[PDB]
Design a protein around this nucleic acid. Structure first.
Length: 280
DNA sequence: CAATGCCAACTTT
DNA sequence: TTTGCGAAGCAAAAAAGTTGGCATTG
């Protein structure tokens, strides 16, 4: 067939698998990129690497590696239904990508927290909850008061299905955060069905929280190496503090893994220990 | 205005 | 992260999070 017409067949395939909405979207976007990037011909290995290197060229290595993967799978499916016989993607180079996002430190957190003094109250409250519970923003915006029962905040992580009970008697010492104290302030000051509500006592979207955290960051005027820290970085911050304040085991469970494997990268400092000397 | 949601195109977990 | 394939560790699969730009409405 033609690449395009086959991409259409491939996505209908993908539409199955049991994939979640967001996942499908991620895949669709990689397929849409392939379109713009390649002709409609039938059959190119160099034609393919031409596209990929075009991404690695402008520093979008992550995308390159993700596209390459999707292209290759589309090809294996084509070879299966018998349309092609060679996976000209296999003969291509798997691009190397390193996380550019820098980790956030306890001190940096305090500065962003102050800089957030110019933001709605839910921001700072969202920041405290994020660090004391080590949960993903996506879940934090789901927490309803009905989820708290007898000193425990029940959480069924959306991304993994993992189910955990977080004790409210919790608190982070290095930062002076008491979960019960934070929760109270959340009930009073915000007052919504969700523990994290908007100015209009309505449910917030992870996207917004992220975004306001980002504003406050710039507002703090802090400098970072590589891509700046984002709201998700509080998850890792949470882990790394709790590791020291309690134990690696504890931090693992709080974060929530299926594996029961204490591998974890949230515990990694990713160089923040090192102090790169300026040059005033 | 300013707070928010939505679509998109990237990067992370 | 989690799974997969091969049996130690990366590559790939699945499902987020990040944030600019446009549009909407208190």
């Amino acid at each position: 067939m033609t690449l395009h017409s086959w991409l259409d067949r491939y996505e209908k395939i993908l539409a199955s698998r049991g994939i979640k909405q967001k996942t499908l979207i991620n895949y669709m976007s990689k397929i849409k990129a392939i379109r713009r990037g390649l002709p409609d011909a039938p059959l190119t290995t160099k034609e393919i690497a031409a596209m990929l290197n075009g991404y690695i060229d402008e520093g979008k290595a992550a995308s390159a590696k993700l596209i390459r993967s999707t292209l290759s799978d589309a090809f294996r499916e084509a070879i299966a239904e018998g349309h092609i016989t060679t996976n000209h993607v296999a003969a291509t180079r798997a691009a190397k990508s390193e996380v550019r996002r820098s980790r956030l430190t306890a001190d940096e957190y305090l500065k962003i927290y102050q800089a957030a003094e110019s933001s709605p109250c839910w921001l700072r409250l969202a920041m405290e909850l994020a660090v004391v519970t080590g949960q993903r923003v996506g879940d934090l915006c789901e927490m309803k008061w009905s989820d708290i029962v007898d000193g425990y905040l029940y959480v069924e992580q959306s991304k993994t299905g993992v189910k955990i009970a977080i004790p409210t008697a919790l608190h982070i010492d290095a930062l002076g955060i008491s979960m019960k104290e934070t929760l109270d302030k959340c009930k009073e000051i915000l007052g919504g069905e969700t523990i994290i509500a908007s100015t209009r006592r309505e449910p917030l979207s992870s996207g917004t929280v992220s975004r306001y955290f980002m504003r406050a960051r710039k507002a703090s005027g802090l400098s970072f190496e590589g891509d700046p820290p984002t709201f998700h970085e509080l998850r890792s911050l949470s882990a790394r503090l709790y590791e020291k304040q309690i134990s690696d085991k504890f931090a693992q469970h709080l974060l929530g893994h299926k594996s029961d494997t204490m591998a974890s990268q949230y515990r990694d400092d990713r160089g923040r220990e090192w102090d790169k000397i300026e040059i005033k």
